[PDB]
Design a protein around this ligand. Structure first.
Ligand code: SOE
Ligand code: SOE
Ligand code: SOE
Ligand code: SOE
Lengths: 387, 387, 387, 387
């Protein structure tokens, strides 16, 4: 029983397995999947990302070498720099995601066996309807992004068909669009890992609340409590320490990809609206281009949202536990042994909090999204008014 | 006895009832009002806001279709975009306020029965003079805003009278001004809900201070304490947990309207001073327009103030309770049972604080107003100097 | 024995008494001063500030009415607005300082009798050398500012002597320079109130440290401790609550003047360097003007420094007390009664901190000065490069 | 036994001794170095920095007096100001570093004898491989910076060889490059002091974790614990107070140099990329200049990194100790004496944290680097688009 992953979190692992983002071996168990590191998939991931980055660099160099008048996507001087910056930031995100995948997956195996212990202690997990909805949402995001990628690729390939270099665009941007797909899969993988962790934290909060109600190794019954509240509070304190450790492991594993993703999102939310506005004020003459630019703006916003939303939900659960603990304290006999257990839990809550701080650069939550959007508007207002 | 609301908070509920912002049934009790959800008022609110938004969109489209030279309000290219942005942000604020009203009102019924329990425990509320002053202030704000709306509508209708399209302006902006009224009523409703909660918190602080003095279900006497301080401190700890729950419920109910209101306030505090300055530097030729622009700048500032002031007062009360608790700790016998109750209260104060964080985006307080005004000036200085 | 103020804090009270900033009656006691509110000085302050503001407004209107070519100080279009903004912000600062003085002085009497109790408990205060140095520093700042005001007034009066309107400049700027003097005196008064409070906090920290050492109503001996450490820690906890109350009273009394002072400092640190640079790049032709502009830039920086430095020192003392308390905890018998007193003191330190937050807008400390200077440079770089 | 310093921290002390940044006497002990203040080295440092600053000022004045067309480095009007600003900020950094060195070294002796006590208590330190790697890294940074300085000096001396004033560039920039070397040595000295402190904190965390495991004056065995966990926790609480004191001493000693270094880094990260881009867009004609500009951009980034990275590692250790303490609390008998010791340690952790706040202006960590880089990009985008 190496890891025994399952649910919607295990669905993106299979999807990420073919993108180089989860070099694991999946052994069916008719209930879950026993995942372990495979060296063959690690080597495949390494060679795939290396080939994709090499092809992306070669296409970026070739499109520069085609020229300004001959090339369709990058037909200016700032256009060449903006296109190169977009291509390179996407390539760097994909390379960070795939080259760091096997170590990330070992860390995943560790905190996932920890989560298996916690889930055995708490008792079961969410219903199959919730995981089906989560799988549907992940598949919807992936398919929407893939459809956008295919549409944009076909549009730019058909635009160069007038010049006759239709296959040149394919050769120069196939790796770029593959790296886009890889980046999206990496974002979704992190988001669903964080969402499964937040589900565990929600179960912990429910168990603590049931300890509060005191209706009166399978700590929970379904709710109902199968142990005295004093024992339950200590077991839940240990479980919360385990959950904090798992959250820290996830943050350590995804900190560099998360920071690169945030930087890429800032860059794209600056550049895409800029040229979308530039195409509008000067002369449209292209409905498909404007549609694609709006869709890409929404795509970058959705990328930022799927990065920062599970962290916000985790922090919200970490505040709900404090509210529950305060209501716990106001109840129970004053000088009883339950009160001292709740005091230990209070010290735990004050000392450590379950949050995400990728690389220590910032905190992943809603205020970060406000700061990024405030900076994007500041840059856009400065840049647009110059033209 | 469903809810039994009363005071100045219940005055805006009747006013909001006709705007679609409080679909409740009011049953008189000669002392308070027993409010409950009515499906007929919910349907009326839905159809009213839908009709108003449809009319607003139709008028915005028609004014665009009139043209640049023919239309009076939006007679440029950036003017059409600025006018559309203002109209759409007002419509979105009103739609968020009215479409989310019935759920907001159910949450209101819940935390209001909780507040009724708390007020029975503490004992009575503020005098009738205070609620009369609050009603006077709310009515003053509402009537000032309505007078400004009517004046602005009449001014822009008379401006188009020279061209002959006086009724066109009416048809294209009636729904816009109705949505302005709805937005103001929603802001006032939130402000007075928060103010009533802050009044309850002030009563709690007074009770805790009376426990400190120890002059020696009607916990308070008037002040005087009718129970031993040890019992009073535990009852007050429970009451403070209830007040925190009620504050969180209010924040959850109003988070989306509050965020949309703040965004609209930022947009308006950017655009209104910009065109007010533009009219001044180039050529005035219009005293009424400049008067209306200054009045609208003050109106947007007052909107931000009525949003962020009750939250600041609530946070100030939440700090006063900490000061009172510290002075409590320094008194009382050192190893007594009162000291341990005060320690539990200290843990409660450290773990949770009574504040407002709409949607988790930010914190509603004075520093947020400073940040918004700092961003507005940064945008204005950049934009004005370009011209 | 109404208040019994003394030291360098009582020196600025006499100076502020003639500026309308301290309408108190000073009764000598050969050791300190028994200060109390006098209605005659309150009326004198009111009429003086009203007359000064009326004269300032009249001079500002007259200088506008003189014209652009005829007037020397404001000889442009932006110059008239910048001059008016400077004059009006100085007038508003002086009006807030003087109109709010009597209530501020009643609050001062309250927390000063509290401080007298604390100082009797701790034992004496700092030596006469320290208060002499503080008086020398305050007098140096006041005399430097007065010399700058007189020099600037004489320079601008002599500049208009060529046109012949030498007395017009006097008539139009006498009240302006008087209000400058009043603003400086108000800043110094707040700074020395905060400095005396920080001295009391430093004495408290020394007493706590002496409790730590345990060398073994005159709690302190000089150091030495005259009471058992358990009693001393409780008395010091009460004293720290009193000091927190006094700090909050000072912040409440000076919050509006402090916020207006910070806004005026931001405005002046924007406008003075702007025109100093503008005079340099275009054509100097005036050494005295550039010298005065540099001196005014340094003056505004010194204003910000004297506002934010005593608050920083107070916060530094509030951190030193936490360090001392931690070292206290690591010592003493583990389960003794002293440990529980130190635990109560720890709860006090965690719950409340001695700082300054004027009006709740911000926190007065070094980071605020960094934020203000960062905004000033951002505005200056944007504005200067446009020219 | 005055101080007994050793390791990679003692290597930069000898290097800084000849730069005026560590006026100490080194007495060999075959295991460590007994360092003490020497007045001769203090006087040498003072005269050396005074001579270097005098020569730097004279060269800056002479290069201005050469002219615009004749001078090669500063051949414009903004170039003269930018060059003067760079030279003066480097000179100010070097002067702050060297003039404040002897007091900094006395503080170093104090907290270093404290660290010797702590290291005797914990037991030994890291292996010789780690200190050899640290010495290699410091030497690599120093030699890379020296090679860049020599290359840049030779390039600018050879550029003036065409005009014939080859020795004029030497005379005008020798002191400038010497001050650059001094600034780099000061940065490395602070970085390695902070790194040695973080190593001590890591040893403390390991000891606390071993107390957790309870395998069962040489508190640690190697791991293993030679004392009961209750005694070990109290000794570790005292050690953590000592480490906090040492961190505060280091921050006090280096606060002014750190703030000046951060300001210089901001200025250089603004100006160097600006002129690097300006040389690119207009006309390159100079590969060596662009190579040097890119190398200087990377150098300034590395300066910021070596300033802010050891502080980030220290804060990371200070969070790891909280995680370890929480896991400690969840274990151990509930009402035992070990639990109360852990509670005292929790109060210590909550009250004080091991971090760096130079002068109180800001906090040295990763978010500060993000804020600086965000401001640099904002200034660069505004400035570049103007041209
Ligand atoms: O084709 C991909 C892409 O370059 O299309 C253009 C968009 O502006 C950009 O954000 C996006 O990455
Ligand atoms: O008539 C309403 C309105 O458009 O009038 C013009 C003001 O600038 C704007 O803020 C306001 O919403
Ligand atoms: O004479 C006062 C004053 O206007 O002089 C000119 C300075 O720029 C300004 O800061 C100062 O207030
Ligand atoms: O020679 C040193 C220097 O002036 O070279 C030019 C670089 O732009 C600058 O950062 C650097 O300090």
């Amino acid at each position: 029983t190496p890891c025994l992953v399952g649910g919607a979190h295990a669905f993106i692992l299979k999807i990420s397995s073919f993108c180089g983002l989860a070099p694991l071996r999946f052994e069916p168990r008719s209930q879950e999947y026993a995942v372990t590191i495979s060296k063959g998939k690690c080597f495949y991931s390494y060679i795939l990302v290396t080939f994709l980055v090499i092809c992306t660099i070669y296409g970026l160099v070739a499109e520069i070498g085609v020229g300004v008048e001959k090339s369709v996507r990058m037909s200016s001087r700032m256009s060449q720099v903006v296109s190169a910056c977009d291509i390179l930031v996407v390539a760097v995100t994909a390379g960070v995601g795939v080259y760091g995948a096997p170590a990330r997956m070992r860390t995943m195996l560790s905190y996932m066996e920890n989560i298996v212990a916690v889930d055995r202690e708490l008792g079961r997990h969410h219903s199959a309807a919730t995981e089906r909805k989560l799988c549907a949402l992940l598949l919807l995001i992936l398919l929407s992004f893939t459809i956008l990628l295919v549409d944009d690729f076909c549009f730019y390939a058909m635009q160069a068909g007038k010049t006759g270099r239709q296959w040149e665009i394919v050769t120069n941007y196939a790796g770029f669009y593959f790296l886009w797909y890889i980046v999206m899969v990496l974002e979704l993988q992190f988001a669903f890992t964080a969402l499964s962790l937040r589900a565990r934290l929600k179960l912990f909060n429910e168990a603590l609340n049931v300890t509060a109600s005191q209706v009166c190794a399978f700590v929970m019954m379904k709710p109902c409590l199968q142990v005295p509240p004093c024992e339950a509070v200590g077991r839940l304190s240990r479980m919360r320490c385990t959950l904090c450790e798992v959250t820290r492991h996830i943050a350590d594993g995804y900190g560099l990809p998360l920071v690169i993703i945030l930087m890429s999102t800032l860059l794209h939310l600056i550049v895409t609206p800029y040229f979308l506005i530039m195409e509008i004020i000067v002369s449209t003459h292209r409905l498909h281009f404007l549609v694609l630019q709006f869709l890409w703006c929404t795509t970058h916003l959705i990328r930022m949202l799927v990065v920062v939303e599970p962290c916000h939900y985790t922090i919200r659960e970490g505040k709900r536990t404090e509210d529950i603990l305060c209501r716990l304290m106001t109840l129970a006999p004053h000088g009883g042994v339950l009160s001292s257990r709740l005091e230990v839990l209070s010290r735990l809550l004050m000392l450590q909090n379950i949050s995400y701080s990728p690389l220590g650069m910032c905190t992943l939550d809603r205020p970060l999204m406000v700061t990024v959007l405030g900076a994007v508007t500041t840059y856009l207002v400065i840049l647009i008014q110059f033209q």
